[PDB]
Write a protein that binds this DNA or RNA. Sequence first.
RNA 1: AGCGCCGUGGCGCAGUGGAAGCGCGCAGGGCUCAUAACCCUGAUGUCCUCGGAUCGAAACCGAGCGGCGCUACCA
Lengths: 470, 143, 23, 25
Amino acid sequence: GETEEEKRKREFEEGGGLPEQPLNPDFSKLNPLSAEIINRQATINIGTIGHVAHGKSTVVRAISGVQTVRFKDELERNITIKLGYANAKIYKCQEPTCPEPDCYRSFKSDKEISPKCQRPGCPGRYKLVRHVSFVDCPGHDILMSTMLSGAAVMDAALLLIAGNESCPQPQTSEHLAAIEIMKLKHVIILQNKVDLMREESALEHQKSILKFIRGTIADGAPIVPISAQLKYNIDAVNEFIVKTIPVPPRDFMISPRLIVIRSFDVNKPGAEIEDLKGGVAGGSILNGVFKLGDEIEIRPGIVTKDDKGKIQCKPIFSNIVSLFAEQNDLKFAVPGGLIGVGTKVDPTLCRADRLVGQVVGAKGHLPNIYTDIEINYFLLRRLLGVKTDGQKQAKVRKLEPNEVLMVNIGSTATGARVVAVKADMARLQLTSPACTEINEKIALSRRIEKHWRLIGWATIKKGTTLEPIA
Amino acid sequence: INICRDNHDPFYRYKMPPIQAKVEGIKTAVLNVADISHALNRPAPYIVKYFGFELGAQTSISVDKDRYLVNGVHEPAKLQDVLDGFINKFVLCGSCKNPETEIIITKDNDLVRDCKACGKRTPMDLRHKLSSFILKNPPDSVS
Amino acid sequence: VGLPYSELLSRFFNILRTNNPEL
Amino acid sequence: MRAKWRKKRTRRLKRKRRKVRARSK
RNA sequence: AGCGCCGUGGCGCAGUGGAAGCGCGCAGGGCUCAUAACCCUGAUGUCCUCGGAUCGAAACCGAGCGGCGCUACCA
Ligand SMILES: Nc1nc2c(ncn2[C@@H]2O[C@H](COP(=O)(O)OP(=O)(O)CP(=O)(O)O)[C@@H](O)[C@H]2O)c(=O)[nH]1
Ligand SMILES: [Mg+2]
Ligand SMILES: [Zn+2]
């Protein structure tokens, strides 16, 4: 005689709920798998890659259950520009009597510590092995900088391929090669379309996929047939994620930083502004233990041009009002997870795609903006993403002086001009600010066929720093 | 919806919507002239007056209020084919046959097809009545 | 090695024939 | 008929064929 | 999520404080030996759903519905 809502509240209470994070715990002892961290933040970032019009977000909603907005009326159907964020909790069940493959269970961010076992007849409770975040990268030919930024923030990969379509999909190859560029060898291949398939056709496509991945960097990548609409083979992907992907080294010794990819103004309309909030920047902490009430500055920040034409950068200092992660407001942030840093920053500053690929540093560190940067570049033999109708995939030409090139350092989408080209190094001038922290893997893309085309990889070697104006 | 041509069957190319006709007493009002006009970068009067030129009957044109009346009994096929003559003679360029070419006047009054992809100045058939029609009303500036 | 791929594949086909006999 | 207009039409057709020559040569 | 616009007889505009408006539609009649032009006469409707104001509200207002033009993806 109980409502579903009263029920859910009951088994949420019986599951231990969602405990509040402590104000000040012992950080020298915390691991990304402490029960304190896993319940209220994601420690592993997983990205999704695939061909256009494939349904990457559909697999994400099958796994977690949180939608990816898909906004802007026009972009409600075709393609979205920003990333796709959803939170999944990997619940294993402690009873070994039930079969291992259906033990694993992925649930939304709102799930409890120990909710009951949905399998009929099993009295076990789920234990949360890890909370993970999901980034749905774009899948189109024009949007490339956001994809590469997502790959840079990615820690694990999920490749999606459809079966009955043509076997050599070049968008998938471009995604995998870009993931290879930014030091990611943890990829799980996913066969999206298996229901409308024959027994021999699936085997032939599997053979084709296995033949495809022989000469690339990634060798031992698993392949899983999942159904995005039928909502099955969900536990298999979760157990594969648990097994093959370990934790990249990210501890508390490394200095704190932030890399903002998305911005979120907080200006709830219609109500009086006497009750208002700040402005949220969606950024990832690849290194750093950030807490509530800390000083931070956006390194490239305010971009201005004087009467002489010189580019001036005013780093945007700001006091962190709040940090948003997982579901509840959290006191201290765990590196290895997208976080909304909600600060006293201006409402307009976070309005549009403005804080897309910028570098932010806490008070107590000085990242350097650079105006001219020396890069060490390497490049492939043929472009990926060009469907040649039976003729020798376009072979890439060597770079030329005075060429506009889209250079993605980390997450920043900058247009560099070539000053010098050499055998294995090059010199780039940035009309848009970029900053150099430590190593910061880079990707290079050219204008060859109308739209952007990835060519190779690069690393920052030298540069001409610009001292910020106080 | 048409693929912007008649004897041309691609799956990828620039789009045009078909035009139709409703009855007035008799003269047919054509609903879909402004949209095709914008899809060909060519004002609606060129569409209507070209249709008339290949037709040979009294016509009425009013761009401010959407009542484009062309007099005669013309089944859908006949006017869509006359508009096909329009697009082939006027809209599409030479090399790639681009369904967006503008009509431009240089310092000489050489009314010319100008493209964007190939971008050539296709030698225009000034030996047509629509050439004089277009030269009478400079594009987007006298309409 | 993609042997643990075809087992899930046959599992999916078996559920396909279980749930949708008309297909 | 009006041989005025027939003669003028012949002159115009000759003009058009001459200009087609002019472009073609 | 909020503000400015609208609510047809088959379509475009209009007065919205005396209650269905014209052009264009159409059925029919008039004219012509004949057709059109014209001349005329007629038929469709819940100015959106429900209230306040008023002798009376499609109408002045409102306690909302359906759809549009901007802010802009607004924790
Ligand atoms: N047959 C089939 N269709 C699917 C499956 N999953 C999703 N789709 C369909 O794909 C279509 C588009 O899904 P969507 O997620 O928006 O594509 P997208 O991946 O975001 C576009 P991009 O690849 O550029 O990022 C949907 O209509 C959905 O029904 C599937 O598993 N099988
Ligand atoms: Mg997305
Ligand atoms: Zn052309």
